[PDB]
């Protein structure tokens with residue numbers, strides 16, 4: 316649903332996943348980062364040391380200026396630019412063309428990456444967190460309003476199998492991309508893709524915190540953030556257990572902070588000493604939830620030059636962010652029509668000789684609604 320969009324994403328480890336788009340008439344081709352954690356469509360529109368190409372408004376007979384500026388601040392990077400509209404399409408995407416809002420980026424700081432291969436960002440979340448304000452229609456809303464594409468997309472983000480790939484199925488769910496059942500969690504509110512974590516286990520041991528801690532101040536699925544990011548108190552409980560699981564090894568302190576590799580001899584990575592992490596999500600029926608299980612092969616992410624890794628779980632003071640390492644090896648369905656996100660085991664699942672990533676349920680969990688913050 317459909318073959319045409321299967322394997323339509325590419326990326327580098329830790330630099331997001333991008334999809335090919337064209338903007339303007341005639342079509343100008345850009346690579347565009349696929350970001351469930353923001354809601355603005357923006358594209359390099361002026362030279363910058365890190366851009367191979369950029370969008371050229373003067374060459375599009377279909378460009379229209381909105382004569383209004385815009386800027387967006389992310390966790391660290393930020394850009395400013397000029398709002399306009401234009402015709403936009405996705406070559407490996409549905410067969411449609413829309414007029415969508417476009418921020419043309421004229422200045423930026425710490426936003427583009429050195430050898431990135433991407434030139435723009437596709438914020439796929441709801442108008443609410445759009446900049447300057449919720450009146451700037453996000454691209455996906457426009458796509459839905461203009462064409463007949465169903466109000467639904469799914470993301471199959473894959474780890475290696477040194478440089479990566481994946482699929483963005485616009486408008487449905489492609490059955491060849493996952494196994495087992497889909498389990499759905501409610502979208503709590505339509506701004507970020509907000510969800511609610513009702514329970515946390517590490518190698519089968521409940522973390523025993525008040526479930527409010529898991530969602531303080533929000534939990535969101537964010538394909539535009541690399542790490543699993545955890546609220547301070549949860550982060551420290553989790554590192555504690557992960558340290559004691561793996562104490563048979565000697566770890567620098569900068570490792571646990573994400574600012575320093577650990578290396579082992581090719582093929583000898585001590586997989587079995589790192590615990591599995593289970594996240595239980597609110598389910599669709601009363602008192603029911605389901606779990607997703609993350610393997611060490613998701614949260615110790617590989618970087619080149621021996622097999623080398625960074626700890627891809629880190630600290631947040633803006634809530635739980637289920638980033639790209641959590642999403643890898645799941646097929647994640649953003650079912651906007653039904654205010655829900657589905658998780659299944661990805662067809663490109665992460666393997667381990669003795670353990671496997673899993674979406675399992677049903678589980679009973681009382682008082683799930685008390686887990687939400689405010």
Ligand SMILES: CC(C)(C)c1cccc(C2(NC[C@@H](O)[C@H](Cc3cc(F)cc(F)c3)NC(=O)CC[C@@H](O)C(=O)O)CCCCC2)c1
Pocket residue numbers: 329330331348350352353354387388389390391392393425426427444445507535537539540541542633636
């Ligand atoms: C855009 C908006 C809505 C105002 C905003 C602001 C701050 C944080 C976010 C959130 N989404 C954040 C998400 O949009 C952005 C997209 C992005 C990807 C990129 F490659 C470079 C960037 F400059 C920006 N990603 C990041 O800021 C993290 C990037 C990097 O540190 C990494 O972890 O890989 C993250 C925290 C929880 C809320 C959602 C969103």
